[PDB]
Amino acid sequence: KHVEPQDAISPDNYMDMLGLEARDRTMYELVIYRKNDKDKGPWKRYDLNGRSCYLVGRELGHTEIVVADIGIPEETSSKQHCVIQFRNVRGILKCYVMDLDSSNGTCLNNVVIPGARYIELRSGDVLTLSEFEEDNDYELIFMNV
């Protein structure tokens, strides 16, 4: 149900406008961990700099068509579950999640977020793809650099 806000911008484009060389820029990523084995490292890492918005959704993949930028092998997640959205909010780069009215819900640090509304993200914030912890096999954590 998602269309980008008028102030949407990618971190790369934002940082370009300020004239910062790559070494002097804030890098954003989504670090994914498998809940059972976090003492083995990140399952996956996604760069979040090239785009202003990223679709998170189910990707089981043993015949199902791929739609989501970021695919999570979680049966209980929706195919278009939540979106990570960067905005230039009156001069400061800010990142938000929105739950796209998914069946099971989305949690930020184990607290259910309301649907159809942008919730501001902070570095370290742990996204999980259900209201209920038992349903979750993966943790998607938003990081600055």
Swiss-Prot record:
It comes from the Eukaryota. One of its GO terms (biological process) is mRNA export from nucleus. Its main location: cytoplasm. Keywords: Cytoplasm, mRNA processing, mRNA splicing, Nucleus. It is found in: Cytoplasm; Nucleus. Disulfide bonds: none annotated. GO terms for molecular function: mRNA binding. One of its GO terms (cellular component) is RES complex. Residues 54-113 form the FHA domain. Belongs to the pre-mRNA retention and splicing (RES) complex composed of at least BUD13, IST3 and PML1. Present with 1470 molecules/cell in log phase SD medium. Required for efficient splicing and pre-mRNA nuclear retention. This is Pre-mRNA leakage protein 1. It comes from Saccharomyces cerevisiae (strain ATCC 204508 / S288c). The lineage of its organism: Eukaryota, Fungi, Dikarya, Ascomycota, Saccharomycotina. The gene is PML1.
